[PDB]
Symmetry: C3
Subunit: 224 residues, 3 copies
């Protein structure tokens, strides 16, 4: 009955709880970036735009690669408003209280685990969407799933540009961080499962690859 | 009969006179930029391309956001040729005569007023076009109208790159100039009018918001 | 019977031999770039991506200008794999043997000539494709044919960014190299032939303009 558990696991509604956790962890990372708090005070619109890149960069990059509107996902009003609320609470909550609660390590690890659930689903969805337009476009499936999982990291040079920062000597392709490298392995696995060359159900691969990401990310977050 | 006046005002043919005024003021601003005259002499093709960004950047950015060909508007041969003539006359007219005439303050203020007529129509058109593709895409309507009104300012970092200039420490989002900020207020107003939450006719909002832009821009141009 | 020869010349199958020659010459140029060998060792994925830009940048830029998926051409699995093989053999062949063979001047000049065959066909194809979407879009035809022939040169600033290099003081538009300038002349000629204002068959223009590019490029390669 393991496949029955995997089917329920791979079909959990990511909206709104799992998307919120994704938004919280991502906007938390934004606040850690140099000058982010100063930017929220002096340039609140650019600060919000930065947070939307962190929350939705996966869809912005996938749509760009597939020639679709890069802000197509912003037609999802409930998601945009929910991410906007997370940005506001993290940067402007009185007593900084929301930050204090979601930074509590037991609470933060849970949100980190829930974000990985969303990232794996995102990779698989990117592969399947590209496949729908290109039945044998293996390289297009791999590219789309990769940017769906990496998110804002693959546009980090230009996320920095928006913030008034320019560091051209490195980029996430030249030197991949773990989530970028892991999303590349993930997109190959999901593309191989799409090819029917990897003899495993789509629900089992989602389950096992998410558990891999959850263990890695929770361990990396608890260590530092 | 104020609505009868507003209907005639909001439906005046922008081509070719009002578009020409837009092109003149924009290419004048280009000539004010550092190295612009030198660039027209040594790199005349890049100089013309820069002028096309100033004249058509509104359509280039809107089409990019909506996933349409970024040079789609360049199929409008008469408009492209008219902007090309304005660029040539401003940079290469014997005796610099065309520049002298259009820089005459009474003449320049009129062209500045006529450009604002075109900008407001552009914002409204961006909102209505996004709405046609996304009936409830409020954030897509706001983004499209914003870039239609801001024009080349929102791509200023890359207009500078084309010119051989790189100033990453600032951008029009991080620090909005008045036309960028005003186009953001404008696009919210036109989106609210699209939502039917703002109880005002589309022709009246065009009239009153254009008069607001005309007074502000004429006053700002005459002061300096 | 010159038109009978020109028809056979303009319809030769570019895949796979003529495309391979294009890939070889382009990836050779990549290896000449500063830090390229070091990058292939430390960042092999970015190195491969750079080589794909050199091999396919024509299609990436044309698709971008026309609002189509920028990686649409990567659905051509055989072409992508063939370019990947060329990249691997040039950077990782034991004894560097593949490099030694294709760098042999008599062999290199032939590959240089065959690449020009592919470039001219690319320019003409860009013009005809834009024409199909815009029957009278002269400026769109010219832009599309231009980027099809110039290839990665028009994205050189961002090919450098991928490599960790940033040199904003120059770009291929501000200062055109010979292949960029020649592709601009070529796209005007093919657009004029599309307009029916240039009284010459499409096969004759391909033949004569390719011979022009072959003589120029072979002479430029043999001189230095
Ligand atoms: Ca598109
Ligand atoms: Cl940073
Ligand atoms: Cl602001
Ligand atoms: Cl998704
Ligand atoms: Cl997707
Ligand atoms: Cl098919
Ligand atoms: Cl400047
Ligand atoms: Cl030039
Ligand atoms: Cl418009
Ligand atoms: Cl529009
Ligand atoms: Cl609908
Ligand atoms: Cl370089
Ligand atoms: Cl790598
Ligand atoms: Cl082609
Ligand atoms: Cl094409
Ligand atoms: Cl038509």
């Amino acid at each position: 009955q393991l496949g029955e558990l995997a089917a329920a696991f791979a079909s959990v509604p990511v909206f709104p709880l799992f998307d919120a956790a994704y938004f919280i962890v991502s906007v938390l990372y934004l606040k850690y970036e140099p000058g982010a708090v100063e930017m929220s005070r002096k340039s609140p619109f650019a600060s919000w735009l930065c947070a939307m890149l962190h929350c939705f960069g996966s869809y912005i990059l996938a749509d760009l690669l597939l020639g679709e509107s890069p802000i197509h996902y912003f037609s999802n009003n409930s998601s945009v408003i929910l991410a906007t609320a997370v940005w506001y609470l993290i940067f402007f909550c009185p007593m900084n209280l929301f930050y204090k609660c979601v930074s509590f390590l037991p609470v933060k690890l849970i949100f980190v685990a829930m974000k990985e659930v969303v990232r794996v689903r995102q990779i698989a969805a990117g592969v399947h969407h590209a496949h729908h337009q290109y039945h044998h476009g293996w390289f297009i499936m791999m590219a789309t799933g990769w940017v769906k999982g990496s998110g804002v990291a693959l546009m980090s040079n230009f996320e920095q540009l928006l913030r008034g920062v320019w560091r051209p000597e490195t980029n996430e392709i030249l030197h991949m961080s773990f989530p970028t490298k892991a999303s590349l392995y993930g997109t190959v696995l999901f593309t191989l499962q799409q090819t029917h060359w990897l003899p495993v159900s789509e629900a089992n691969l989602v389950f096992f690859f998410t558990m891999f990401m959850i263990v890695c990310k929770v361990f990396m977050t608890a260590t530092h």
